Amino acid sequence: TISVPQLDCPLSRPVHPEGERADAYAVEWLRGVGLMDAAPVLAVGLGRLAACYVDENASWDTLAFMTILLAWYAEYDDRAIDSTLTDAEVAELHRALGEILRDRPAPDPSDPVQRGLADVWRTLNGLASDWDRAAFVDTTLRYFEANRYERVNIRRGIPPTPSAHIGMRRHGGHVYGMYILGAAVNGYRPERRVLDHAAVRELETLAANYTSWANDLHSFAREHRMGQVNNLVWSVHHHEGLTFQQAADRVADLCDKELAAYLELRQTLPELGIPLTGATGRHVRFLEDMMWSMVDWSARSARYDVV
Amino acid sequence: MTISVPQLDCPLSRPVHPEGERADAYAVEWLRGVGLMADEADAAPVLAVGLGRLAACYVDENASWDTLAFMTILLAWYAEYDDRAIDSTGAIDGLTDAEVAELHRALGEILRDRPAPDPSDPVQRGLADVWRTLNGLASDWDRAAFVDTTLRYFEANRYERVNIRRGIPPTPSAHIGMRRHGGHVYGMYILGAAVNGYRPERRVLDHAAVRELETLAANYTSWANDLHSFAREHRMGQVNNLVWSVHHHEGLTFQQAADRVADLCDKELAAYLELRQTLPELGIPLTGATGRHVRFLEDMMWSMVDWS
Ligand SMILES: NCCCC(O)(P(=O)(O)O)P(=O)(O)O
Ligand SMILES: [Mg+2]
Ligand SMILES: [Mg+2]
Ligand SMILES: [Mg+2]
């Protein structure tokens, strides 16, 4: 067995009240769309994560789209990346899903993932709010390429160097795309003058690092049973020669240090000329949400139980 | 009050351009001809820096004297600006924040093909000269990407000077993140593509693997530069050094800090090799311009190690 370390995050946030309802809605959508007994899915709690990602006074339509998006993400990652399909099949799937992102109809309406992604795209564009869709599509392309990289690593059966995994994981979790979608769906648009600043980019990188290392720390057991070798705990144990417990301890230590660096940069931001006032403030707060979201939600989700 | 700097074996060797020594002399000439230095000054530390040998590391062996000369000019202008604005702060030669902001504005104006607002400033004269010569020596390149990297470079300069005025080194993660902008490494990749004759397709450069490999190589280059320049930067007060930050926040002696920095260099080089070797399976062949780009990435790693 393994002992999951604790993660002190000085960032708290209230959850949306209809979370349980969204859980039910999640199953409905999947069964209504064709991606999929309904009480092992309610235990995962895809609607409560969505509740962590939306504002407290948000419409059922918005919270519903958040639940739909997180449910589609969970199905693609598990179905296509780490529960193996051939590489050619995966490449054609990437092409087809990229075509849906090109506003064309689904090339294979019989594929459940393709229909689901078309639904997600239509629903997202309905609550447009005037967002940079092209940047989101670019992050999605990098996400697909990183998925292919992960599948290569799984086929070899050995974890990459910690540096190589840490680099590619930011694309493999599509965290930057989640930042873009959060800006789109909630109703704030940060200036392009601010986002292209080096300090903001490195702050985003720190926050994404914290989120992804926390996710690895919590999901290590399920990812090890399935053979998903793209885990920071895996690589630390393999290349630094440490026990799984020592590896998890080292990863939690790295999480702590990255959080400290994140706070240091956030405090330095005003002096450089970037005030955390308007859309910049809500963007930084969204960055803070995903870090707390992993710590609080992963311990409450039935994704990681091995019962 | 001493330190022992560890060695660094990097298995990337290359034949050097023969006229390197000439460029060293030419370097001093340019610095005298533009106004950055003058006449009576001992031209023994400028020949000791070896700006022409770095230029030789950055060009092909069968290249024109014009090419080596421009590389030396660019590396000499970068070295003077770094010392003038970043490393000579906290002293009587220190620049003010208003002066640095005006320099940013004017140099950005020179970078937008406009004439220098203050032709009396030597930095502006040198940058205008570099810009005119470079625009003559090339074409079909991403100029906008280079200008954006320059904007991020200036922003990182502002961050570093704030950190210096506080008198405290930043967190290791925050330092590692912002250093890539503070070292103008991505701009150097773009310029290397520019001065040579290779242009890799955008389908390849925008690939996720190519982006993260660049990050590993830039990390290695910058950490090596810090490991070697730690003693001088610690004496002068430049707090943006990885050894300094390891000593400050990780609770280690200066020797342990340098040892950890060298260990991180080793581990990052191994990671770089792992990704570089795996690259073909993902669909990126190291054949045409992509191979020459990777060779430039490897060159900057070895050049910094040797140039101590
Ligand atoms: N957006 C999809 C996120 C999926 C994961 O977070 P999970 O731990 O839930 O499997 P990953 O496979 O990245 O570890
Ligand atoms: Mg995955
Ligand atoms: Mg997964
Ligand atoms: Mg995981």
Burial class (CB in 10 A: 0-12, 13-18, 19+), A40: exposed
- Any idea of the CA torsion for A156, B213, B221, B126, to the nearest 10 degrees? 170
Contact A82, A223 (CB under 8 A): yes
Nearest to B213 by CA among B172, B268, B174, B255: B268
* CB within 8 Å: B177 and A202: yes
Helices (H) and strands (E) in chain A, counts: 13, 0
C-alpha count within 13 angstroms, C-beta hemisphere, residue B183: 24
Query: Does the beta carbon of A288 lie inside 6 Å of ligand 1?
Result: no
- Put simply, whether B159 touches A (Cβ < 8 Å) is yes
Q: How far is residue A290's CA from residue B225's CA, in Å, rounded to a whole number?
A: 35
Q: How far is residue B189's CA from residue B13's CA, in Å, rounded to a whole number?
A: 19
Structure token pair of residue A42: 């309610």
Q: In sequence order, which residues have a C-beta less than 8 Å from that of residue A295 and are 6 or more positions away?
A: A7, A9, A214
Q: How many CB atoms lie within 10 A of CB B234?
A: 18
Q: In sequence order, which residues have a C-beta less than 8 Å from that of residue B284 and are 6 or more positions away?
A: B204, B207, B209, B210, B290
Closest CA in chain A for residue B282: A149
Residues in chain A closer than 8 A to B177 (CB atoms): 202, 205-206, 261, 265
- Put simply, whether B212 touches A (Cβ < 8 Å) is yes
Nearest to A211 by CA among A238, A241, A182: A182
The CA–CA distances, whole Å, from B99 to A294, B94, B96, B104, B147 equal 45, 10, 5, 9, 21
Q: How far is residue B187's CA from residue B210's CA, in Å, rounded to a whole number?
A: 15
Query: Does the beta carbon of A79 lie inside 6 Å of ligand 1?
Result: no
Q: How far is residue B114's CA from residue B127's CA, in Å, rounded to a whole number?
A: 12
Query: Does the beta carbon of A224 lie inside 6 Å of ligand 1?
Result: no
Question: What is the three-class DSSP state of A132?
Answer: coil
Residues in chain B closer than 8 A to A198 (CB atoms): 152, 155-156, 159, 178, 181
Query: Does the beta carbon of A77 lie inside 6 Å of ligand 1?
Result: yes
- Put simply, whether A90 touches B (Cβ < 8 Å) is no
For residue A120, give the amino acid letter: V
For residue B81, give the amino acid letter: Y
Residues in chain A closer than 8 A to B267 (CB atoms): 161-163
Contact A47, A67 (CB under 8 A): yes
For residue B85, give the amino acid letter: A
Structure token pair of residue A262: 């994140």
Contact A209, A244 (CB under 8 A): no
Q: How far is residue B209's CA from residue A229's CA, in Å, rounded to a whole number?
A: 18
Q: How far is residue B111's CA from residue B136's CA, in Å, rounded to a whole number?
A: 14
The CA–CA distances, whole Å, from B145 to A196, A197, B131, B137, B148 equal 12, 14, 15, 18, 5
Q: How far is residue B4's CA from residue B7's CA, in Å, rounded to a whole number?
A: 9
For residue A90, give the amino acid letter: V
Contact B111, B117 (CB under 8 A): no
Q: How many CB atoms lie within 10 A of CB A31?
A: 12
Residues in chain A closer than 8 A to B278 (CB atoms): 152
- The count of residues in chain A is 307
Q: How far is residue A11's CA from residue B286's CA, in Å, rounded to a whole number?
A: 45
Nearest to A293 by CA among A201, A218, A229, A226: A218
What is the SS3 assignment for A183-197? HHHHCCCCCHHHHCC
Angle between helices B242-249 and B172-182 (to 10 degrees): 170
Q: How far is residue A169's CA from residue B215's CA, in Å, rounded to a whole number?
A: 14
Contact B119, B107 (CB under 8 A): no
Contact B223, B258 (CB under 8 A): no
The CA–CA distances, whole Å, from A125 to A90, A118, A132, B94 equal 26, 11, 11, 53
Burial class (CB in 10 A: 0-12, 13-18, 19+), B111: middle
- Put simply, whether B216 touches A (Cβ < 8 Å) is yes
Q: In sequence order, which residues have a C-beta less than 8 Å from that of residue A4 and are 6 or more positions away?
A: A217, A218, A248, A299
Question: What is the three-class DSSP state of B157?
Answer: helix
Q: How many CB atoms lie within 10 A of CB A119?
A: 18
Q: How far is residue B24's CA from residue A67's CA, in Å, rounded to a whole number?
A: 63
**Ligand 1, atom nearest to A228 Cα:** 12
Question: Which of A41, A69, A76, A77, when mutated, tests ligand 1's pocket best, judged by the most ligand atoms within 8 Å of its CB?
Answer: A77
Burial class (CB in 10 A: 0-12, 13-18, 19+), A114: buried
Q: How far is residue B33's CA from residue B84's CA, in Å, rounded to a whole number?
A: 18
Contact A14, A55 (CB under 8 A): no
Q: Which residue's C-alpha comes closest to atom 7 of ligand 1?
A: A219
- Any idea of the CA torsion for A157, A252, B226, B307, to the nearest 10 degrees? -10
Structure token pair of residue B25: 């002399």
In chain B, positions 171-200, which contact chain A (CB-CB < 8 Å)? 171-174, 177-178, 181
Residues whose Cβ atom is located within 5 A of ion ligand 4: A 215, 219
* DSSP for residue A158: S
Please tell me the number of the ligand nearest to residue A169's CA: 1
Q: How far is residue B56's CA from residue B72's CA, in Å, rounded to a whole number?
A: 8
* DSSP for residue A277: S
Whole-number Å distance, alpha carbon A216 to ligand 4 midpoint, is 4
For residue A129, give the amino acid letter: S
Question: B82: annotated binding-site residue?
Answer: yes
Q: In sequence order, which residues have a C-beta less than 8 Å from that of residue B64 and are 6 or more positions away?
A: none
Contact A187, A283 (CB under 8 A): no
Q: How far is residue B77's CA from residue A151's CA, in Å, rounded to a whole number?
A: 45
Query: Does the beta carbon of A230 lie inside 6 Å of ligand 1?
Result: no
Question: What is the three-class DSSP state of B153?
Answer: helix
* CB within 8 Å: B148 and A196: yes
* CB within 8 Å: B209 and A161: no
Contact A82, A153 (CB under 8 A): no
* CB within 8 Å: A198 and B181: yes
Question: What is the three-class DSSP state of A157?
Answer: coil
Q: How far is residue A295's CA from residue A292's CA, in Å, rounded to a whole number?
A: 5
Contact A67, A55 (CB under 8 A): no
The CA–CA distances, whole Å, from A270 to A266, A276, B263 equal 8, 7, 35
Nearest Cα of chain B lies from the Cα of A241 at a distance, in angstroms, of 14
Residues in chain A closer than 8 A to B212 (CB atoms): 164, 167-168, 171
Spell out where chain B has E strands.
Answer: none
For residue B151, give the amino acid letter: L
The CA–CA distances, whole Å, from B40 to B28, B32, B44, B45 equal 12, 10, 11, 13
Angle between helices B254-278 and B242-249 (to 10 degrees): 120
Nearest Cα of chain A lies from the Cα of B117 at a distance, in angstroms, of 24
Structure token pair of residue A31: 């069964």
> What spatial distance separates the first Cα and last Cα of chain B, rounded to whole Å?
20
Structure token pair of residue A197: 């600043």
Contact A48, A22 (CB under 8 A): yes
Burial class (CB in 10 A: 0-12, 13-18, 19+), B93: exposed
Q: How far is residue A302's CA from residue B247's CA, in Å, rounded to a whole number?
A: 42
Method in brief: X-ray
Angle between helices A232-240 and A244-268 (to 10 degrees): 120
Q: How far is residue A114's CA from residue A95's CA, in Å, rounded to a whole number?
A: 11
Question: What is the three-class DSSP state of A2?
Answer: coil
Residue with tokens 């990182």: B156
Q: How far is residue B205's CA from residue B211's CA, in Å, rounded to a whole number?
A: 7
Residues in chain A closer than 8 A to B158 (CB atoms): 272-273
Nearest to A50 by CA among A213, A290, A210, A279: A290
Q: Which residue's C-alpha comes closest to atom 13 of ligand 1?
A: A173
The DSSP string of B164-191 is HHHT----HHHHHHHHHHHTTHHHHHHH
Residues in chain B closer than 8 A to A204 (CB atoms): none
C-alpha count within 13 angstroms, C-beta hemisphere, residue B261: 33
Q: How far is residue B23's CA from residue B50's CA, in Å, rounded to a whole number?
A: 9
Residue A34's region, left for phi above 0, alpha for psi from -120 to 50, else beta, is left
Q: How far is residue B31's CA from residue B33's CA, in Å, rounded to a whole number?
A: 6
Helices (H) and strands (E) in chain B, counts: 14, 0
Q: Indicate which of B153, B159, B222 best probes the interface with A, i.e. most A CBs within 10 Å of its own CB.
A: B159
Q: What resolution in angstroms does the PDB record give?
A: 3.0
Q: How many CB atoms lie within 10 A of CB A157?
A: 8
The CA–CA distances, whole Å, from B264 to B148, B215, B253, B270 equal 29, 14, 16, 10
Nearest Cα of chain A lies from the Cα of B278 at a distance, in angstroms, of 9
Nearest to B86 by CA among B240, B286, B304, B269: B240
* CB within 8 Å: A206 and B173: yes
Q: In sequence order, which residues have a C-beta less than 8 Å from that of residue A262 and are 6 or more positions away?
A: A203, A206, A207, A210, A291, B173
Q: How far is residue B16's CA from residue B242's CA, in Å, rounded to a whole number?
A: 30
Q: How far is residue B114's CA from residue B37's CA, in Å, rounded to a whole number?
A: 25
Q: Indicate which of A143, A163, A168, A262 best probes the interface with B, i.e. most B CBs within 10 Å of its own CB.
A: A163
- Put simply, whether A19 touches B (Cβ < 8 Å) is no
Contact A135, A183 (CB under 8 A): no
Residue with tokens 């926390």: A214
The DSSP string of A99-124 is HHHTTPPPS-TTSHHHHHHHHHHHHH
Contact B214, B186 (CB under 8 A): yes
Residue B223's region, left for phi above 0, alpha for psi from -120 to 50, else beta, is alpha
Closest CA in chain B for residue A146: B208
Angle between helices A198-226 and B172-182 (to 10 degrees): 120
Whole-number Å distance, alpha carbon A79 to ligand 3 midpoint, is 9
Residue A71's region, left for phi above 0, alpha for psi from -120 to 50, else beta, is alpha
